[PDB]
Amino acid sequence: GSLANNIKKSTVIVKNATHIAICLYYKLGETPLPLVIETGKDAKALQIIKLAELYDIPVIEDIPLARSLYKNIHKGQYITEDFFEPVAQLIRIAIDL
Numbered sequence: 001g002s003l004a005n006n007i008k009k010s011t012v013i014v015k016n017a018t019h020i021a022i023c024l025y026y027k028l029g030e031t032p033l034p035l036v037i038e039t040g041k042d043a044k045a046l047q048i049i050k051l052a053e054l055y056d057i058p059v060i061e062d063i064p065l066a067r068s069l070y071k072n073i074h075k076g077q078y079i080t081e082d083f084f085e086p087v088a089q090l091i092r093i094a095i096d097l
């Protein structure tokens with residue numbers, strides 16, 4: 001579960017500037033719900049965002065959602081029902097792209 005490999009397979013990243021980055025992973029047939037596969041604050045959020053760019057993972061800024069995911073959903077956990085709609089919207093955009 002190395003940082004680069006996690007980002008590489010991620011579906012979408014949601015961010016609050018350089019402070020927080022949340023890497024979400026959803027694949028029908030593999031994940032029953034979107035999974036928080038990687039998270040970072042500060043230097044680590046910066047690392048995530050540069051790797052995202054290198055691997056062409058869509059990065060969407062949403063400050064309240066990035067904040068709330070970071071507070072509530074730890075790396076390696078699925079999202080909770082609170083997040084289903086908002087994260088479903090972010091996944092559809094990533095698919096759009």
Ligand code: PRO
Nearest residue numbers: 070071072073074075
């Ligand atoms: O400090 C926080 O807000 C988050 C909670 C889970 C991991 N870090």
